Amino acid sequence: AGTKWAVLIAGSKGYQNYRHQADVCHAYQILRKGGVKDENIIVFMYDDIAYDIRNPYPGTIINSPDKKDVYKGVPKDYTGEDVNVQNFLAVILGNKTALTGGSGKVLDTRPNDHIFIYYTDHGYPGVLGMPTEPYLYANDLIDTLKKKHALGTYEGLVFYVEACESASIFEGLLPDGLNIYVSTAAKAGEGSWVAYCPSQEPPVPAEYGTCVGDLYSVTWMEDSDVYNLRTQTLHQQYELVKNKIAYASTVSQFGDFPISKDSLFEYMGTDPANEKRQYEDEPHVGAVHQREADLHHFWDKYQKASEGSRNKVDARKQLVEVMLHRMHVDDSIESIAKLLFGSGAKASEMMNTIRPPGQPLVSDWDCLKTMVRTFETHCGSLSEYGMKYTRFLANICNSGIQKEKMGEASAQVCL
Amino acid sequence: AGTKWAVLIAGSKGYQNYRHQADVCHAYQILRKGGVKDENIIVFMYDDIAYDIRNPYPGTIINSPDKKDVYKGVPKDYTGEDVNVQNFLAVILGNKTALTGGSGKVLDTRPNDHIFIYYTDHGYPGVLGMPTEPYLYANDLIDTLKKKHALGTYEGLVFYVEACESASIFEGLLPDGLNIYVSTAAKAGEGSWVAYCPSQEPPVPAEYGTCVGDLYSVTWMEDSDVYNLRTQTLHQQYELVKNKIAYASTVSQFGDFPISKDSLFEYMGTDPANEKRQYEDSSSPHVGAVHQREADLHHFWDKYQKASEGSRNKVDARKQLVEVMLHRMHVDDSIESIAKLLFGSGAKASEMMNTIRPPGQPLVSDWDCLKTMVRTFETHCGSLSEYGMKYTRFLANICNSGIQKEKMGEASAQVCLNFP
Ligand code: NA
């Protein structure tokens, strides 16, 4: 028999992103109650939520309207600036010597071990967000999992991905014989949903002032919380979550499908208190899209501010500026598209042009990274809003446009 | 090999429209007996028939004088207010995220799959009825089928349309090469016939108090019910139904005629109990001439005439019947007066109300203008939903003539003004 290991990562920071760290803390509680040991649970969370000045209940983090704390006892392996690509990949590979900091807890796994990786945050076509620069490109993650497989240091690896466009991290990249089973919250071109907001569906107390969960995440976690996990397979959870959140986003699976025949117990253990709660088979809580969760906040601030006050004038100005910036980024991309391809634009059609199923986002990932840097050098940093344009940039690469031509068109539109 | 999928939709509601939901439930029974799975059969029915207070046999729906129930086991994917354009189009496209409600069952089809779409209700020039507004405009449906084709998520798609003027949904709009074969009950300018009314040739027992089938529908369905469907092609069913009901309406076909070479089995499966009933190649059943709008009235007349004299039931049924008829008169007078105001003479008004564009031409060039004209008329003159949507021909002619919404609005306001 082997050891059950886990890697839990929130790829974001800021109180607005409370939900991603809340999701991670909840995933830890499940694994802990299931009998998975702390020494085998690697936690990556920026850790700026529990004691943020906006937190109504400092020292606590909730992930449901039940207001149950999930923060207590959560290991702090990689926090702050240690939540970075380098540490995440070295952790997966089990290389303690490649770390920039942190506890040094890694996936120093053996061939009969089981691995459960859970990522939660912002996602973009072929890119997962990080609270630190740089972002996680899909090819680096897949290369890492291929290297992990080559080492032969596990029997089964399960990867759950909570992010917009998360199918694009695995689609046309992940080979099927690595003993890796992947479940993603949304497909290419799709945004994932937040759950448990003060003003949306099940009532979360207004004082939290942010959404405390992510729809795909709370769905699989609330399910994992209430059953004897020996009685529910990974496949049955996939189907359960997929069907339950189908109205919001499309749960997709990748890799080695026979791995999903394993019970959830094989990866998450099981809570003895749920032994009699057997799974038999084989109420919308979804709030808003992740990419509009911050915008909903600027709106709420503006709406709640008193008429005629300086607070209303300021919140209005801030909200208008956030929206004008989205218009500026959209116009810059459209102007670049017109320059590279002709005045008949297509910026929106290219962006609404997603490759056929089973095809990777881009053929040349170095070209994609280069196109991002090239846009960012002449124009502003893409950051949260504009990172969705990795699709347009991937299309430029696939079309054969060179960095010099992107640099030329970018300098011309962005002065 | 692929999976056989189906979308069954009754575009109406109300006990007077019992027949369209009966038609759908019967189509489901055929598909079920043919081996087509429930998970692949999307049903849209308002579902206000089985337990309507006027139903003599609650929990049952019949589609023939044989009184055989067709309601049992019919999936309830989209019922009530979920029978709407948005859900119908998202279902076709296989988009679960674009639904307003319902089961979430969609045409989440693969490239080798077969699709059978069956629509039954009221039809109008370039518009199919929905249980409430907005109605289904032909351009949106055709755009949806073009988008579906672009996705490449099917091998063959068969669309049967039971409705008046149903050829106008595809005429001048549906291209070839989409692997879509269409069969329609009636051509432009033609009303479709109903079947099995309490006073039609083979009559339904009187207690049903309404017509229980539609002629084109019961013809293809009764045929699909009795044969080994491997031995009858879509083309043979087309010729069979067309010839059998030629006295009533013109069955028309659109799209990719080589698709119709496929056996009915490829879309509807086949009932093992009919294996020995091989299709080959007494023609005396001629139903009485009852058109869609005449059928709706049969019900209002029935609950009036059967009600006891002096009873609150008779007074209520009388009032509703008089109001239904006065409303038809109001819509007819308004459109005619509007036509006279815009075009200057009874002759030109009549021309604009009645002209059918040549065959192969779309009803209207500007579908947004048509939608606008409908909304403009409705704003000043009241809903065309209950009755009057047959006047989309007149509205399409207004559009094609270059009349603007402001001129339609002034004429409608002037005509439908009726206060001190
Ligand atoms: Na009307």
Whether the CA torsion B131, B132, B138, B139 is positive or negative: it is: negative
Q: Are A47 and A76 in contact (CB under 8 A)?
A: yes
Specify which residues B128 forms β-bridges with: B123, B136
Report the catalytic residues of A.
122, 164
B317 contact partners, CB below 8 Å, separation of at least 6:
B300, B303, B304, B307
Exposure on the CB side of residue A281, measured as CA atoms within 13 A:
8
Residues B275 and B419 in one domain: no
DSSP code for A410: H
Number of Cβ atoms within 10 Å of the Cβ of A76: 13
For residues B406 and A374, give the distance between their C-alpha atoms in angstroms, rounded to a whole number.
52
Answer yes or no: do B198 and B342 share one domain.
no
Instruction: Classify strands B213-214 and B194-195 as parallel, antiparallel or unpaired.
Output: antiparallel
CA B331 to centroid of ligand 1, rounded, Å: 7
Residue B344 sits at the chain A interface (C-beta within 8 Å): no
| φ, ψ (nearest 5 deg) of residue B233 | -85, 165
For residue B242, report the phi and psi dihedrals to the nearest 5 degrees.
-55, -50
Q: Do A277 and A414 share a domain, yes or no?
A: no
Question: Integer distance in angstroms from the first to the last C-alpha of chain B?
Answer: 70
| Residue in A243, A247, A289 to test binding to B, most B beta-carbons within 10 Å | A247
Angle, helices A293-304 vs A310-341, to 10°: value is 150
- What's the longest Cα–Cα distance across chain B? 73
**Could you tell me if B238 and B246 are in contact, meaning their C-beta atoms sit under 8 angstroms apart?**
no
Give the environment of ion ligand 1: residues with CB less than 5 A: B 383-384, 386-388
Please provide residue A263's backbone torsions phi and psi, each rounded to the nearest 5 degrees.
-70, 160
Q: Kindly report the CA angle at B9 between B6 and B14, in degrees rounded to 5? A: 155
Q: Are residues A22 and A161 in the same domain?
A: yes
> Which residues in A lie closer than 8 A to residue B99 (C-beta atoms)?
247
- Interchain pair A249, B104: CB under 8 A: no
- Chain B closest CA to A241's CA: distance in Å? 14
Single-letter residue type at B402: G
User: Do residues B285 and B309 share a domain?
Assistant: no
C-alpha B302 – ligand 1 centre gap (Å): 21
With contact defined as beta carbons under 8 Å apart, do A26 and A220 qualify? no
Q: Which of B77, B87, B97, B147 to mutate to test the interface with A (most CBs of A within 10 A)?
A: B97
**Does residue A10 sit in helix, strand or coil?**
strand
> How was this structure obtained?
X-ray
Q: Any chain B CB within 8 A of the CB of A167?
A: no
The values of phi and psi at residue A269, to 5°, are 70, -160
User: B99, A190: Cβ pair inside 8 Å?
Assistant: no
In chain B, residues with a C-beta closer than 8 Å to the C-beta of A249 are 97
> Are A260 and A167 in a shared domain?
yes
- Work out how many domains chain B is built from and give that number: 2
Q: In angstroms, what is the span from residue A278 Cα to ligand 1's centroid?
A: 55
The whole domain housing A146 covers: 1-289
Identify which of B106, B117, B154 has the alpha carbon closest to the alpha carbon of residue B31.
Answer: B117
Q: Which residues pair with B213 in a beta bridge?
A: B195
User: Looking at the complex, does the CB of residue A246 fall below 8 Å from at least one CB of chain B?
Assistant: yes
CATH number, domain of A172, equals: 3.40.50.1460
What residues have CB less than 8 Å from A187, skipping those under 6 apart?
Answer: A165, A167, A249, A250, A252
Helix B234-245 vs helix B215-226: crossing angle, to nearest 10: 130
Bridge partners for A161 per DSSP: A119, A184
DSSP 8-state code for residue B271? -
Ligand 1 centroid distance, CA of B383 (Å): 5
| Radius of gyration, CA atoms only, chain B | 21
Please check whether residue B104 touches A, CB under 8 A.
yes
The structure tokens listed for A356 are 């056929």
Cα–Cα distance measured from residue A370 to residue A361, given in angstroms and rounded to the nearest whole number: 15
> Catalytic pick from B25, B164, B197, B399?
B164
Longest dimension (CA), chain A: 68
CB of A160 within 8 A of CB of A223? no
Chain B interface includes A402 (CB < 8 A) = no
CA–CA distance, B95 with B226 (Å, rounded to integer): 35
Q: CA-CA distances (angstroms) from residue A263 to A28, A258, A266, A273?
A: 18, 11, 6, 17
Question: What distance in Å separates the CA atoms of residue B205 and residue B211, rounded to the nearest whole number?
Answer: 10
B328 touches A: beta carbon within 8 Å: no
Q: Taking a C-beta distance cutoff of 8 angstroms, is the pair A264, A224 a contact?
A: yes
Helices (H), A49-137: 85-93
Neighbours of B220 (CB within 10 A): 26
Q: Are residues A279 and A295 in the same domain?
A: no
The two beta strands, A127-128 and A136-137, are antiparallel
B384 Cα–ligand 1 center, Å: 3
A138 and A51 assigned to the same domain: yes
- Partners of residue B109 in chain A, C-beta under 8 Å: none
Shared-domain flag, residues A410 and A327: yes
B122 in active site: yes
Q: Are A380 and A345 in contact (CB under 8 A)?
A: no
d(CA B320, CA B332): 18
Sort out which chain A residues have CB atoms less than 8 A from B96's CB and list them: 246-247, 250
A205 Cα to the center of ligand 1, angstroms: 48
Which positions in chain B touch A250 (Cβ < 8 Å)?
96-97
CB A126 within 8 A of CB A169: yes
A64 CA to centre of own chain: 18
Note whether B96 contacts A: Cβ–Cβ < 8 A.
Answer: yes
Q: How far is A68 from chain B (nearest CA, A)?
A: 31
Question: How far apart are the C-alpha atoms of B171 and B18, rounded to whole Å?
Answer: 29
Work out the number of other CB atoms within 10 angstroms of the CB of residue B66: 10
- Which residues in B lie closer than 8 A to residue A243 (C-beta atoms)? 104
Burial A300-309 (b: 16+ CB within 10 A, else e): bbbeebeeee
Query: How distant, in Å, are the alpha carbons of A86, A208, A210, A212, B258 from that of A17?
Result: 22, 12, 8, 8, 56
- Domain final residue, candidates B252, B275, B291: B291
* Catalytic member of B26, B122, B298, B380: B122
B97 vs A: CB within 8 A: yes
Q: In terms of domains, do A318 and A379 share one?
A: yes
Helices A403-414 & A310-341 angle (0-180, nearest 10): 140
Cα–Cα distance between B218 and B120 in angstroms, integer? 11
The verdict on A172 and A309 lying in the same domain is no
Q: Are residues A198 and A306 in the same domain?
A: no
- Which of residues A271, A289, A307 is at a domain's end? A289
- Calpha distance A3→A154 (Å, rounded): 9
Cis omega (within 30 of 0) for bond into B134: yes
Counted across chains A and B, CB pairs separated by less than 8 A come out at 13
> In the listed set B291, B325, B352, which residue is the last one of a domain according to the structure?
B291
What element of type H or E holds B127?
Answer: strand B127-128
Residue B160: which H helix or E strand, with range?
strand B156-162
Taking the alpha carbons at both ends of chain A, their separation in whole angstroms is: 62
A249 with B97: Cβ contact below 8 A: yes
Which DSSP category does B177 fall into? S
Distance from CA of B322 to the nearest CA of A (A): 45
The resolution in Å comes to 2.1
